[PDB]
Design a protein around this ligand. Structure first.
Ligand SMILES: CCS(=O)(=O)c1ccc(CC(=O)Nc2cnc(O[C@@H](C)c3ccccc3)c(Cl)c2)cc1
Lengths: 9, 245
């Protein structure tokens, strides 16, 4: 997901 | 069992994380208060298409959300949580944090909000066709403005808005509960120093923020069903991820 990407994990 | 020193350090850490990610300077928002949309400017917004007004608002909200993501990343306890729980908390909490932060941009004396460079009333948003939601959001902003939050109070309160152990789907609920309690201790400690614990009883019930977010999702359903292509083509992908069903 995009949140995953933004959180770097 | 966090010591008084550790709680004091937590206060400082939360306030630093917030200062670094607060998006706009409070001083700048307050300086702009005399800059109000004219009757003709308001009319211009009201005469915009529903799709264009939704698109503008989704963009602005997403920008605000990106700062909230950065806030979370700088909250030491947040990165201690497992990957799933970070996502669960941000997905549910991002909008709630933005709603709270937005009270900084609200002027209770004339009931206006800072939007696209000037202050405008709730009638500015009429083209969205969700007047009840906008009214509820303005009511919420008004209620928070009456509390006269300092920036440090906003930092500590929004940290608690984000670290909410009641969110469904947490893999390590007890870990979130511990961090939440420590942040409660931080908030209460800070308030005690300034004789501001009186505001605790006046804070909105948690169900209120949940209600506003539910309402937002429902109004987006109404919009997206009417204009599905514009959401797919033009809306920020993060906005879709967080809010579309
Ligand atoms: C939040 C961080 S901040 O630094 O305080 C900040 C403040 C303002 C801005 C400019 C901006 O985005 N304004 C705006 C105002 N109202 C908007 O909708 C109404 C319906 C609204 C009113 C109150 C609360 C929520 C939503 C939107 Cl979609 C954007 C950027 C940053």
């Amino acid at each position: 997901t995009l949140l995953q990407l933004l959180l770097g994990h | 069992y966090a010591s008084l020193t550790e709680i004091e350090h937590l206060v400082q850490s939360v306030c630093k994380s917030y200062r670094e990610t607060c998006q706009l300077r409070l001083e700048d928002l307050l300086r702009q208060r005399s800059n109000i949309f004219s009757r003709e400017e308001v009319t211009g917004y009201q005469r915009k298409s529903m799709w264009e007004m939704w698109e503008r608002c989704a963009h602005h909200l997403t920008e605000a959300i990106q700062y909230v993501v950065e806030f979370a990343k700088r909250l030491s306890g947040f990165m201690e949580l497992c990957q799933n729980d970070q996502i669960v908390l941000l997905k549910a909490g991002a909008m709630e944090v933005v709603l709270v932060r937005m009270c900084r941009a609200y002027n209770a004396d004339n009931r206006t909000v800072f939007f696209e460079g000037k202050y405008g009333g709730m009638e500015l948003f009429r083209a969205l066709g969700c007047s009840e939601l906008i009214s509820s959001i303005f009511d919420f902003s008004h209620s928070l403005s009456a509390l006269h939050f300092s920036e440090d109070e906003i930092a500590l309160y929004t940290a608690l808005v984000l670290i909410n152990a009641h969110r469904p789907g947490l893999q390590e609920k007890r870990k979130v509960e511990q961090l939440q309690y420590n942040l409660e201790l931080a908030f209460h400690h800070h308030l005690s120093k300034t004789h501001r614990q009186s505001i605790l009883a006046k804070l909105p019930p948690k169900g209120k923020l949940r209600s506003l977010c539910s309402q937002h999702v429902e109004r987006l359903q109404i919009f997206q069903h009417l204009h599905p292509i514009v959401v797919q083509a033009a809306f920020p992908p993060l906005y879709k991820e967080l809010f579309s069903t």
